[PDB]
């Protein structure tokens, strides 16, 4: 999750209900 | 501290493609988070008739389908990436590379993404569109 | 109702590769002021976009499209931003009765905004496979 | 060509070439 560091953010909240 | 990079279509496409294929490989059970309620997804396949497979919508459906294609130690060579400004500040990305899965054979893929502005946070995007086709499956 | 994206998609694609074949100097009529076009090319790196009909009419001819044959082997279209349609075409294209070449192609279609069932190409991304898998 | 290019959707703009 250190590799997902960048100038722009593509990662959203999880709509996975459970 | 650091001022924000401008959302240069090519920079958004290059940064998103390293994350996409990094997270596919290291964590495909998370890959469902790049997507939104509306998002559309298709990733190869040859249905009963022997023709290319249908697509699904929203995180849950997409996750379902991602978990069903068992991605183990999926490696990716990426041999070209094209990213252009499209509607409503959205970025359309054409990706050409090879994907080996489970140390099975490196097959060549054609792949269209559309990244949309996310609306709430600056420089934040969601994958509106994810069309992935293998070439052996089509030629 | 809001058109079917694949109905729209197959139709643009048969229209597109008909004109490319018959009247490729009219191929610019598909684009607007701000539309991206890149149709393959090594400089020697993969070539850059050009914007709007006038810049597009240009490049089009800068490629000597003659007796241009195409076998489209797959089309996939889908609803996208702003009742737009993203289109992914795979197929083989022969120019000037030379080699038959595998291509990837992405199109974004946007409603024209005036007549319903009218669209225009916002975006056009073509690549010869032989220029990338060398 | 003109007959052949007729279809259920229109993609042809006005020629913007002065």
The technique by which this structure was obtained is: X-ray
Tell me the CA distances in angstroms from D18 to B27, C52, C53, C63, C121, one per residue in order: 54, 13, 11, 22, 20
Sign of CA dihedral B30, B24, B61, A12: positive
Residues present in chain B in total: 139
Nearest CA-CA distance, residue B1 and chain C, Å: 34
Nearest CA-CA distance, residue B55 and chain A, Å: 19
Class of domain B8-138 as given by CATH: alpha beta
Alpha-carbon span C50 to C53, nearest angstrom: 9
Q: What is the spatial order of strands in the sheet that B75-86 belongs to?
A: B56-57, B40-43, B125-134, B107-117, B90-100, B75-86
Are residues B45 and A2 in contact, defined by beta-carbon separation less than 8 angstroms?
no
Q: Do B94 and C74 touch (CB under 8 A)?
A: no
Provide the Cα torsion B48, B51, B56, B59; round to 10°: 90
Structure-block tokens of residue B116: 């949309």
Q: Which residue has the tokens 């006038």?
A: C54
Tell me the CA distances in angstroms from A6 to B17, B121, B122, B124, C125, one per residue in order: 11, 14, 13, 11, 26
Are residues C35 and C49 in contact, defined by beta-carbon separation less than 8 angstroms?
no
Are residues B35 and B59 in contact, defined by beta-carbon separation less than 8 angstroms?
yes
Resolution in A: 2.9
On whether any CB of chain B is under 8 Å from the CB of A5, the answer is no
Comparing CB atoms, the residue among C81, C86, C132 nearest residue B88 is C81
The CATH number of the domain covering residues in C4-132: 3.10.450.50
Comparing CB atoms, the residue among A3, A8, A16 nearest residue B59 is A16
């Amino acid at each position: 999750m250190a590799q997902m560091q960048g100038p722009y953010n593509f990662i959203q909240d999880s709509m996975l209900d459970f | 501290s650091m001022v924000m990079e401008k959302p240069s279509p090519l920079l958004v496409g290059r940064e998103f493609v390293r994350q996409y294929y990094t997270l596919l490989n290291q964590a495909p059970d998370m890959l469902h988070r790049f997507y939104g309620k509306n998002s559309s997804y298709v990733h190869g396949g040859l249905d009963s008739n022997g023709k290319p497979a249908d697509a699904v919508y929203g995180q849950k459906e997409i996750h379902r389908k991602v978990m069903s294609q068992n991605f183990t130690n999926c490696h990716t060579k990426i041999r070209h990436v094209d990213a252009h400004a499209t509607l409503n500040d959205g970025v359309v990305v054409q990706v050409m590379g090879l994907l080996s899965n489970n140390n099975q054979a490196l097959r060549r893929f054609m792949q269209t993404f559309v990244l949309a502005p996310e609306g709430s946070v600056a420089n934040k995007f969601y994958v509106h569109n994810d069309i992935f086709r293998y070439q052996d499956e089509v030629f």
